[PDB]
Amino acid sequence: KVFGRCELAAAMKRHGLDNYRGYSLGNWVCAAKFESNFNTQATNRNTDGSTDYGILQINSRWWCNDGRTPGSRNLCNIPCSALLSSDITASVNCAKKIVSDGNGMNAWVAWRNRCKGTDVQAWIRGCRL
Numbered sequence: 001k002v003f004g005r006c007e008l009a010a011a012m013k014r015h016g017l018d019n020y021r022g023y024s025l026g027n028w029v030c031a032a033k034f035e036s037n038f039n040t041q042a043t044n045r046n047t048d049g050s051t052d053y054g055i056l057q058i059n060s061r062w063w064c065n066d067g068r069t070p071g072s073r074n075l076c077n078i079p080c081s082a083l084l085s086s087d088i089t090a091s092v093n094c095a096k097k098i099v100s101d102g103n104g105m106n107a108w109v110a111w112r113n114r115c116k117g118t119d120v121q122a123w124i125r126g127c128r129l
Contacts, residue, residue: 001039001040001041001086002037002038002039002040003032003038003040003055004038005029005033005038005123005124005127006124006126006127006128006129008029008032008038008055008088009025009028009029009123009124009127009129010127010128010129011088012025012028012029012032012088012092013025013129015088015089015092016092016096017092017095017096020096020099021096021099021100021104023099023104023105024120024121025123025124025129026120026121026122026123026124027105027111027115027120028095029120029123029124030111030114030115030118030120030123031056031105031108031110031111031115032055032056033123034110034111034113034114034115035052035055035056035057035108035110035111036054036055036056036057038055039055040054040055040083040084040085040086040088040091041054041084042054042055042057043084044057046059046061048061049068049069049070050069050072051066051068051069051080053066053080053081053083053084054083054084054088054091055083055088055091056083056091056094056095056108057108057110058076058080058083058091058094058095058098060072060080061073062075063075063076063078063094063097063098064076064078064079064080064082064083064094065078065079065080066079066080066081075097076090076093076094076097078090078093078094
């Protein structure tokens, strides 16, 4: 499913991401925009043979099992395929673990390169929230 900006913001807010570990809603919507362009079915393969999945492009090397990343750790206890659903609950639950892991939102390269230190509040402006 391809989210609209305000629709995603509303879903993420509902799932408890606004200000989770001090990251305002705008940071999360910005992250999704640049990781996946708001597409839950987005997948990308990396050089190491791991794959990034869903709206927040969570990586199979640490976070989910996809059955083809030798030595993966499965920390979110989830098939990576669950990260592609139109329901973002699994993605959000996993993301909360990732962000609490010690590097914050820096675990998302597109956040660090394209959202970090920018006016993230622009990603929720105009939304009914």
